[PDB]
């Protein structure tokens, strides 16, 4: 629980022995695995402790040298204490994060010649609002609404003209919006509102905005209030309610109305971006998919909102990336590319250049990309500003390079900045900061981490898919959390690197693709025409198709999964726990889709071992006739229809990944309606509510889980009720928390709310900006200009 | 629209003639009707001037002597302007309320001997939160929640919150509630809540409080967080939310659930109170009915809230009124009488005494009851404190006497005060303030209006049954509004008498009972024993029972009225408009219950002279066999089934009153499923949503009224189908607004939220208290010792 | 020097005897001269108590009735404290100024038929500089 909890050294012997066991090292920087395994034996010598076990299990790392243990303890999510204890006199002594970092620094890279620069955002963050409770992290906009509206009770009546001015400052294509003159004087606006509301009661509700436009110009009202008079009344009553007694719901509803979001600029500079061969390719993962789906959703919502307020303008989204001249049948040389499924969304590629540029010809790795980014950023400003009629209304960053670029851009243009990192590596590769010089030539984390810090501080909001990515869990620190404090020896120390409790953090999860994956019970949209291909692929044999197989006995319930062939997705372990417990072989059958059935010849090697182990398991456990394994890709729609097939008859999906960041396949399955057994570890922990929406299973316990699978397959002559109830649970859960519709609705509101928050809190943050700008010029700029040796 | 709208010098000849027509000095004080009269002849001379019609129709009154006319203008609801115009050279001059009231004073009672006392609540209310839009009046609790949470946010951002202390100070029946230690510390309470919660995670839902209590007590928690672990979790979660970021809805939900209220004291000292027997007695009436059908609902709710929080104490309700030793045939000499239908609800009766008292044996009229009330209040305070275990949690006053007593009682005890005036007679009797001297002998308004001002200002919240009771209409000023400023010659002048935008005003509308008036369509509950008796009341005739209808039209639609026979209830208007229209005559048959008649007196003189016009209009126009008539008074349980019968076989209710404040009758009708045609003038305007819940009729135009009714009767197959639409409309409107269950939920919340507002805002209100106490002692006390001579 | 200073219960018979000396009802309202006068003898029996002397000399007035003594103390310029003490069990109890004045009003003009109007400038003055 804390530093005082090490009074567990009444029973001194045990603590003494434990530190003894740590000090005998081979390693002076210990992490969790060693810290924990060293608790048991010596444990039985001498004692059995609950309190001590509690303590050890909360240690994140420890540093031993001297007769001195330096312990870093993380008792509750997002809270850290640091202490040191001496081997002989055992007296836990509180340390500051800085003291601990100075020790770690010393032990690792040796006595410091000069003094270390300590980057400290603490004084810069004092005074700004924070969430108080770890359960609430990622919910930032709710807190922020309550803060805004609670402080919008300015019955000083000068204010919130903040709200009024704000309403005055946005205009679309030169046309002033909401207000003809920038008015303030809350008493006047209440007047105008009263009159207008009154006239609208004598007008045909459905009157086009264009008919009552001049009359409203008389009353001081520019357009943007609505399409028909009914909507104008709605929005005007909203503002009238707010100018009287502000409340969180009201202010969110009205702020969500404002036709101030017109042009998006999404930024994803590294890799090969385009809609063709995904995944494949260097630097290009399901990276492209998030953005293409996101922008489709986004563009729909943009359009709808704008339309509803009666403003005719066409929204435009730009996805800006690098133009690589040496392409080879990717579209990556092609400067503008219209995005499929979107009216006005486009891909704009801008080339990298040298200072004289002289456009850089060939693909560059994302670990090498840093020296190009500033020049790139300038060219993107020029070109995107050219392509949209002016400034974007929101700039969204992607990964580390995208976020840095979005940072420079947003500062240049005065635009609200969103950050989607998707992954922060500092947590993935342990010790990579203290040791950064080793990893430097491959990875260049000196650049990446610095850029990361720069961006997470610079952003207006930060969007993540899971809570875990922010604060992690009781056991594991989160990805953003990792940056709170660290040393990069010979470069800088960081404390207060980020505030997990700042309300910039919003979890907005993706979902869908709901054109592709949808319920089995959908009265249309089903492709029944693709059912033959699917019964072919499940129940066929031989040299017809790339499989190992031929189950027969089809009358039973079914067990499905699909994944890249590995090792992490852990298909083989599913096979194995299927085998080892006979009651499951009894109750159902396994279908599997991935890699290559038939040899590894043919292809790619790589996965290799997992293909071979797959075959091996196949032979040895004699799993033919209970198991169908297909070695193919399965184009998306086909796959969707398949997940749909397995649902009725009463099937299940199981993705027993060792750990899964955010489960997409879990969502696609739940979307299709299959009751799903997913790994306990990572995103699925959030996605599925256990026994309601689906089932958490330990991938690290086989046949303990198979017992739960079989248990489910039972319950009253197969499953009349339960399966249906869990399917509805799944459907209900996807519909509530994971959908691109919901995503885009949120995203489009967040931009407006954080834009207002920026409008109000803007000048308060200038010391922070002067700090971040200095740190970019004098720290990032040198590091990147070394890359670039 | 306003003062400058007398720019009508655009046509000032018409203005001069309007003034001259006014100055003819038939009256010094010209009211609304006589002001509107002056605009019709002069009409045919000279011109029209719509502007002038706007101005004149917005005058509430004007005061004429000399060349000078003084005008009180009420442009829109609750907004006043005052001006003076000179007859000869006419230019308007803007006046302050003080100026206008001074001139009103020095005209009617003539020039002052010494300076008037101006009671001014203005400087006292300055600074307190108030509503802005007039349409929000009577919504107060909502506004207050918004100010409460808005302020709690900034306070919780700094160190403290009063919420915690307030949680500390209610211990119901001697046992400590909500908190064990007295800890004022928010961080601490956050920690305790955290642990408590995490510990509830480990138990399952239904664990009864009795079990959790000791573990909870180690954690710092007294009981009242819930009955089982589920609910404790629920409410501790509410407090956790609030302590993180206050919002109005969460705050109102948490406040709403605190086990504060186990004891009501309801005050009604005048009339003969008693269970039943009382209809027709002096000062008594359906006045008692409000209280008596309210308290069952109240008791039930109070108990429920307590039960849910897992506190087992039995709540008490005391209805306190006067002991009249003269039986006068009643139960009114009984000190403690249990209200039937309730577990713990009691009428506690207390004698009036003289200054040596010496119990006063005899009935005293409300108008003369003033001098006894302070003595009474002391006596009530003692007796009631004895009968309840201790202090009541809320004190409700009724009428003027009840409210003055509650004022006194609540200041002594420090208890939340609710006021229900039920009516405020200052608007009922024309000029009864300026002319108060005249009316003293009979009415004693000098005392009443003083106590009225006192009480309105003293109460923590005021419950009214309709909006217009507070702020009236575009035409009418409201009952409370009239106390905003007024003069009381040789006593004092009031300005700022009440603020209509004060959050203390809440419209909470009663209804029903509901064991009696319920939908014609019920699976059970109906009274068929009455069903033969019913038919034989309408259908039989002549000398075998009260007369005289003889309908004889078996399937003909029914038109039902039931009321007093008196002038304003206006049955005469209904029958008149019935005879006058032949089509209405053909479509349905008019049934009537009221009067004694039967012979003109004997019995019941002399206002039942309305029987004259009753027979006069019934014989000519040849009504009989078209229209049945009962002189019966209809025992309530029967009448309930009579309403239930008039639907299927289908029919309607008609309440053609000239003016009706609430219209409980209508509530009953609608509650029973009857489409209702109700007067436009008064509360029925609020109760019925026209062409949804019923229809509004202008009792003035009989042509259009009966026409409308007919048009209703002609719809579709003859209304299969739209009788049913309105019937369901009424049913739903009644379950969603007027029910004693709803009333009780709202009351039990209002008492908690205004308890907290009193708690939090009390010290700031101290100057207001000292002012009101001085006013009482030095002004009221003398006026009531004048009685009392 | 305050209500706490009648902790002069170190010598209890002194306090008791003093109250007795006062309580003999000659005047129920004593001013300084009387109040102080009564100090000397007690000043013999029993003891001296410079503390007690200090206290008594700071008394502005007292009101004696029943086994109850209502004291008004004025320790330093423009500061007053009010207390009442029971003749037999002697426990100083702190009084509000209203309580003390209610007692004086009762002792002098008799129990009251109606509540007294209390004029109070405190709320009015709260917040202005001092």
From Swiss-Prot, chain C:
It comes from the Bacteria. Homotetramer. Belongs to the glycosyltransferase 1 family. Catalyzes the reversible conversion of sucrose and a nucleotide disphosphate (NDP) into fructose and NDP-glucose; although the reaction is freely reversible in vitro, the physiological reaction seems to be sucrose cleavage. Unlike characterized plant enzymes prefers ADP as a cosubstrate, whereas plants prefer UDP. The KM for sucrose is 8-fold lower in the presence of ADP than UDP. Its preference for ADP over UDP suggests it may directly link sucrose and glycogen metabolism. This is Sucrose synthase. It comes from Nitrosomonas europaea (strain ATCC 19718 / CIP 103999 / KCTC 2705 / NBRC 14298). The lineage of its organism: Bacteria, Pseudomonadati, Pseudomonadota, Betaproteobacteria, Nitrosomonadales.
């Amino acid at each position: 629980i804390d530093t005082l909890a090490t009074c567990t050294q009444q029973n001194r012997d045990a603590v003494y022995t434990l530190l003894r066991r740590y000090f005998t090292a081979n390693r002076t920087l210990l992490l969790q695995s060693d810290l924990r395994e060293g608790l048991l034996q010596t444990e039985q010598d001498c004692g059995q402790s609950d309190m001590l076990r509690a303590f050890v299990f909360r240690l994140q790392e420890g540093i031993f040298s001297s007769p001195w243990a330096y312990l870093a303890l993380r008792p509750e999510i997002a809270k850290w204490e640091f202490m040191r204890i001496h081997q002989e006199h055992l007296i836990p002594e509180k340390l500051t994060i800085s003291e601990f970092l100075k020790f770690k620094e010393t032990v690792v890279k040796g006595e410091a010649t000069e003094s270390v620069l300590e980057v400290d955002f603490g004084p810069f963050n004092r005074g700004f609002p924070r969430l108080k409770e770890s359960r609430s992290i990622g919910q930032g906009v709710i807190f922020l609404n309550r803060k805004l509206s609670s402080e919008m009770f300015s019955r000083i009546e000068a204010g919130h003209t903040s709200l009024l001015h704000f309403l005055g400052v946005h205009a679309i294509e030169g046309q002033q919006l909401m207000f003809s003159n920038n008015s303030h004087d809350i008493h006047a606006v209440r007047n105008q509102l009263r009159q207008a509301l009154e006239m609208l009661e004598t007008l045909d509700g459905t009157t086009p905005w264009i008919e009552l436009a001049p009359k409203m110009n008389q009353l001081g009202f520019a357009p943007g209030w609505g399409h028909n008079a009914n909507r104008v009344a709605e929005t005007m009553n909203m503002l009238m309610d707010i100018l009287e007694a502000p409340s969180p719901s009201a202010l969110e509803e009205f702020l969500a109305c404002i036709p101030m979001i017109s042009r998006l600029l999404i930024l994803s500079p590294h890799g090969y971006f385009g809609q063709d061969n995904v995944l494949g390719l260097p630097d290009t993962g399901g990276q492209v998919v998030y953005i293409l789906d996101q922008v489709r959703a986004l563009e729909k919502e943009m359009h709808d909102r704008l339309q509803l307020q009666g403003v005719q303008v066409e929204p435009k989204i730009l996805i800006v990336t690098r133009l690589i001249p040496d392409a080879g049948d990717t579209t990556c040389n092609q400067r503008l590319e219209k995005v499929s499924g979107c009216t006005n969304t486009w891909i704009l590629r801008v080339p990298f250049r040298k200072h004289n540029g002289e456009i850089i010809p060939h693909w560059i790795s994302r670990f090498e990309i840093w020296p190009h980014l500033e020049i790139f950023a300038g060219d993107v400003e020029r070109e995107a500003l050219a392509e949209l009629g002016g400034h974007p209304d929101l700039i969204i960053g992607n990964y580390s390079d995208g976020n840095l670029v979005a940072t420079l851009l947003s500062r240049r243009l005065g635009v609200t900045q969103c950050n989607i990192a998707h992954a922060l590596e500092k947590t993935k590769y342990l010790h990579s900061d203290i040791y950064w010089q080793e990893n430097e030539d491959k990875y260049h984390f000196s650049c990446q981490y610095t850029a990361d810090l720069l961006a997470m501080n610079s952003a207006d909001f930060i969007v993540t898919s899971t809570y875990q990515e922010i604060a992690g869990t009781r056991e594991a620190e989160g990805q953003y959390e990792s940056y709170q404090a660290f040393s990069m020896p010979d470069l800088y120390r960081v404390i207060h690197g980020i505030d997990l409790f700042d309300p910039k953090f919003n979890i907005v999860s993706p979902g869908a693709n709901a054109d592709i994956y949808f319920p089995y019970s959908d009265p249309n949209r089903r492709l029944h025409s693709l059912i033959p291909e699917i019964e072919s692929l499940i129940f066929d044999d031989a040299t017809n198709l790339p499989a190992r197989g031929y189950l027969q006995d089809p009358d039973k319930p079914l067990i499905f999964t699909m994944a890249r062939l590995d090792r992490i997705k852990n298909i083989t372990g599913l096979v194995e726990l299927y085998a080892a417990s006979p009651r499951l072989r009894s109750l159902a059958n396994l279908v599997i889709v991935g890699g290559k059935i038939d040899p590894q010849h043919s292809s790619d090697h790589e996965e290799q071992e997992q293909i071979h182990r797959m075959h091996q398991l196949m032979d040895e456990h004699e799993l033919d006739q209970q198991v169908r394994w297909l070695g193919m890709r399965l184009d998306k729609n086909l796959a969707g229809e398949l997940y749909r097939y397995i649902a009725d008859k009463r099937g299940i999906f199981v993705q027993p990944a060792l750990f899964e960041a955010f489960g997409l396949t879990i969502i696609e399955a739940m979307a299709s309606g299959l009751p799903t057994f997913a790994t306990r570890y990572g995103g699925p922990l959030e996605i599925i509510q256990n026994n309601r929406s689906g089932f958490h299973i330990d991938p690290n316990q086989g046949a303990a889980t198979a017992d739960l699978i079989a248990d489910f397959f039972e319950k009253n002559l197969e499953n009349p009720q339960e399966w249906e109830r869990i399917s509805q649970g799944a459907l209900d859960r996807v519909a509530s928390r994971y959908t691109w519709k919901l995503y885009a609705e949120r995203m489009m509101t967040l931009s407006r709310i954080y834009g207002f928050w920026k409008f109000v809190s803007g000048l308060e943050r200038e010391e922070t900006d002067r700090y971040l700008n200095m740190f970019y010029h004098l720290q990032f700029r040198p590091l990147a200009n070394r890359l670039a040796h």
